[PDB]
Ligand binder design. Structure first.
Ligand SMILES: [Zn+2]
Length: 54
């Protein structure tokens, strides 16, 4: 029951976001920065802000 365990013969650079595929590094990048591009929240400019953590 494998029916898998294979890739694509041509475009090795496969997007690690959706699964797309490209031939060049820059080409794929644009897609990840043109389609996947988005904004995400970050820490308060520090590892721990509260009383303690770890
Ligand atoms: Zn993608």
């Amino acid at each position: 029951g494998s029916s898998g365990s294979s890739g694509s013969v041509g475009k090795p650079y496969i997007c690690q976001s959706c699964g797309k595929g490209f031939s060049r590094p820059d080409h794929l990048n644009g897609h990840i920065k043109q389609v996947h591009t988005s904004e995400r929240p970050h820490k308060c400019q520090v590892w721990v802000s509260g009383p303690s953590s770890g």
